[PDB]
Amino acid sequence: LHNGLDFSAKVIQGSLDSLPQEVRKFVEGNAQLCQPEYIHICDGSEEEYGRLLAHMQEEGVIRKLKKYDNCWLALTDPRDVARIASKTVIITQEQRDTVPIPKSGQSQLGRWMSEEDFEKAFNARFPGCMKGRTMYVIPFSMGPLGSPLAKIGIELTDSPYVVASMRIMTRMGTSVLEALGDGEFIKCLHSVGCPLPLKKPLVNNWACNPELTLIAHLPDRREIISFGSGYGGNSLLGKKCFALRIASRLAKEEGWLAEHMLILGITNPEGKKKYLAAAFPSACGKTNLAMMNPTLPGWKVECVGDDIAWMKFDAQGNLRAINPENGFFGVAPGTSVKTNPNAIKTIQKNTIFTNVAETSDGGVYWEGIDEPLAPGVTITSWKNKEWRPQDEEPCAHPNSRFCTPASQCPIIDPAWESPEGVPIEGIIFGGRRPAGVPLVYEALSWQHGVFVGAAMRSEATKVIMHDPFAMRPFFGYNFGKYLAHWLSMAHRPAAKLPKIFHVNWFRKDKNGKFLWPGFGENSRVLEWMFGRIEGEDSAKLTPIGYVPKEDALNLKGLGDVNVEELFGISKEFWEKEVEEIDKYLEDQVNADLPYEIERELRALKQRISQM
Numbered sequence: 313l314h315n316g317l318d319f320s321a322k323v324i325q326g327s328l329d330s331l332p333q334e335v336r337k338f339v340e341g342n343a344q345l346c347q348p349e350y351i352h353i354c355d356g357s358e359e360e361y362g363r364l365l366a367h368m369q370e371e372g373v374i375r376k377l378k379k380y381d382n383c384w385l386a387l388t389d390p391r392d393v394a395r396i397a398s399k400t401v402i403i404t405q406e407q408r409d410t411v412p413i414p415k416s417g418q419s420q421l422g423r424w425m426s427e428e429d430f431e432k433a434f435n436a437r438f439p440g441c442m443k444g445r446t447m448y449v450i451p452f453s454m455g456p457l458g459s460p461l462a463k464i465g466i467e468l469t470d471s472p473y474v475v476a477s478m479r480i481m482t483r484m485g486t487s488v489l490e491a492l493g494d495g496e497f498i499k500c501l502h503s504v505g506c507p508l509p510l511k512k513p514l515v516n517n518w519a520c521n522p523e524l525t526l527i528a529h530l531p532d533r534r535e536i537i538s539f540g541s542g543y544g545g546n547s548l549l550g551k552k553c554f555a556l557r558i559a560s561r562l563a564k565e566e567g568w569l570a571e572h573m574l575i576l577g578i579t580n581p582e583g584k585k586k587y588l589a590a591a592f593p594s595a596c597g598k599t600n601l602a603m604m605n606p607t608l609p610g611w612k613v614e615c616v617g618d619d620i621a622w623m624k625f626d627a628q629g630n631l632r633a634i635n636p637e638n639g640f641f642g643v644a645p646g647t648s649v650k651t652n653p654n655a656i657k658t659i660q661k662n663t664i665f666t667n668v669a670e671t672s673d674g675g676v677y678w679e680g681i682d683e684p685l686a687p688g689v690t691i692t693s694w695k696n697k698e699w700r701p702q703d704e705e706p707c708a709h710p711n712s713r714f715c716t717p718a719s720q721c722p723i724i725d726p727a728w729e730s731p732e733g734v735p736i737e738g739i740i741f742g743g744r745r746p747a748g749v750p751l752v753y754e755a756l757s758w759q760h761g762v763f764v765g766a767a768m769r770s771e772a773t774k775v776i777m778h779d780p781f782a783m784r785p786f787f788g789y790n791f792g793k794y795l796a797h798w799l800s801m802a803h804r805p806a807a808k809l810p811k812i813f814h815v816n817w818f819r820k821d822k823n824g825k826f827l828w829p830g831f832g833e834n835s836r837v838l839e840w841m842f843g844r845i846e847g848e849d850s851a852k853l854t855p856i857g858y859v860p861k862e863d864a865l866n867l868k869g870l871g872d873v874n875v876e877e878l879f880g881i882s883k884e885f886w887e888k889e890v891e892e893i894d895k896y897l898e899d900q901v902n903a904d905l906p907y908e909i910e911r912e913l914r915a916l917k918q919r920i921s922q923m
């Protein structure tokens with residue numbers, strides 16, 4: 313009867329008429345709510361990308377790093393990279409479907425918000441929030457475009473930085489819209505929460521609204537709604553929100569797994585290849601392992617993904633995995649030629665860096681880069697202040713990131729985009745334990761292995777905290793139900809259940825020194841797993857699982873590594889370990905703890921009692 317709902321006049325790239333019906337309704341409905349000045353339907357092209365970066369550059373939002381081929385630096389408002397667990401929520405009808413109800417009495421395993429409370433929060437944030445801004449429409453695929461394991465999302469955002477970062481971290485643009493058609497998609501809505509004219513001052517040219525920041529997931533509506541943060545997992549909605557939180561629930565419903573894991577292909581000196589997956593928490597070295605440069609001659613490691621794994625059993629019973637991402641969103645500090653040479657090669661072109669330092673010659677810098685600068689070369693830190701090494705504060709944010717295309721990794725796996733995925737033959741769990749836990753062990757069965765994931769603990773970055781499956785920040789639903797879902801894989805037709813190992817790269821001696829060199833040397837641990845998967849009698853039984861036999865690991869080229877301390881298993885340590893695990897599972901999982909996990913707990917306690 314007027315113009316009405318129709319936002320066609322405001323579209324500055326693409327066409328509302330070209331969009332699938334449901335994609336149009338999502339765009340237009342949110343344009344009516346958020347009141348953007350313009351709508352830009354992203355095409356994913358090189359031209360779109362370069363022009364948006366230059367626009368951000370001209371506005372002071374990013375800086376060009378002149379030392380490299382098409383690389384960039386964003387410095388954020390320091391408020392927009394903090395602990396946001398309290399403000400990261402999942403909405404379901406019943407709380408218990410999202411988190412187990414704890415016995416006493418705050419859950420560490422997720423954060424639920426009622427539908428009613430979320431609706432009020434939403435209405436207090438989104439109306440008018442994009443006034444004076446462009447709403448970008450990002451059509452994106454999580455996984456290779458053709459894969460039956462891939463899933464499609466549409467992200468609406470008012471941040472150009474999100475558009476640029478999503479082009480790297482997902483497959484995005486017109487091809488995705490054409491693959492989608494009338495199919496289902498995850499609705500992803502994001503705003504930085506700073507309508508124009510600005511009500512509060514802009515800090516460091518970085519739009520955000522810390523007071524109203526809220527990152528919400530609505531699995532039953534297939535929706536992610538995020539407000540107030542421009543940063544990382546809060547804004548690049550494909551990564552944690554979709555590919556872990558939403559996806560873990562879809563995976564529960566549909567019979568597959570969405571995990572905080574790397575995927576790698578390892579080939580031995582007789583040309584035999586196996587794929588492995590590994591779940592470690594943030595700051596425990598997934599990205600180092602996924603891109604490993606092995607030291608043992610004749611071995612080769614190739615990278616499928618470094619952070620998220622999606623996995624489903626096929627009709628042959630193979631556990632097929634895809635990497636749903638298109639890039640690596642990797643921790644910058646600590647990355648060097650010695651810790652990750654393949655990453656260093658990857659990130660020297662077409663890469664966006666966030667919150668790292670800049671050298672006077674237009675290069676990047678961070679703690680642990682291990683590269684001397686020429687005399688006269690100076691460094692600008694991440695807070696835009698001159699910085700000297702003798703100063704107390706750090707130069708780059710400790711969780712600062714690179715965002716790089718996966719196709720540029722020199723050891724990217726030839727099957728990293730294969731639509732059927734790669735067959736997983738082993739699953740590795742691990743974290744930072746300074747004491748008690750040996751370098752590597754093998755779980756005794758599937759059920760024991762699920763227990764091993766459930767029992768994971770790690771030093772916080774002193775305090776040791778539970779982080780089951782490295783998924784504590786990411787469960788899309790009740791953790792006890794997640795354990796039951798893992799256990800149910802053993803009831804599948806023809807399932808070839810992978811060997812579950814637990815590793816510890818981080819054990820230390822009584823003065824604080826690491827007992828194992830790690831990095832490329834971890835190839836020696838992977839050799840042992842490869843053979844154990846092959847059925848080699850290289851294993852000795854212990855109470856916690858199988859460990860390598862004396863002389864089973866190749867230790868040539870390493871000095872006198874203290875194997876007695878590194879593989880030591882102490883009754884007193886493991887007695888304490890089991891009681892703590894018992895109390896945690898009772899409190900935090902309570903009535904939803906599967907019978908099989910309580911049984912594995914009882915069995916471990918018993919094996920320890922007989923030492």
Ligand SMILES: Nc1nc2c(ncn2[C@@H]2O[C@H](COP(=O)(O)OP(=O)(O)OP(=O)(O)O)[C@@H](O)[C@H]2O)c(=O)[nH]1
Pocket residue numbers: 592593594595596597598599600601619641642643646817818826829830831834
């Ligand atoms: N001692 C030792 N440290 C390691 C090893 N591998 C990685 N690290 C350390 O782990 C950290 C790097 O890992 P991150 O990239 O933060 O961990 P991630 O699992 O990729 O984390 P997200 O990307 O946040 O999921 C650095 O502190 C490294 O020193 C190893 O084999 N031995």
Ligand SMILES: O=C([O-])C(=O)[O-]
Pocket residue numbers: 544545593594619
């Ligand atoms: O950003 C990440 O990958 C994380 O926090 O694990």
Ligand SMILES: [Mn+2]
Pocket residue numbers: 572593594619
């Ligand atoms: Mn991660």
Ligand SMILES: [Mn+2]
Pocket residue numbers: 598599618619641642643
């Ligand atoms: Mn990583």
Ligand code: NA
Pocket residue numbers: 372373374386387388389516517518
């Ligand atoms: Na900035």
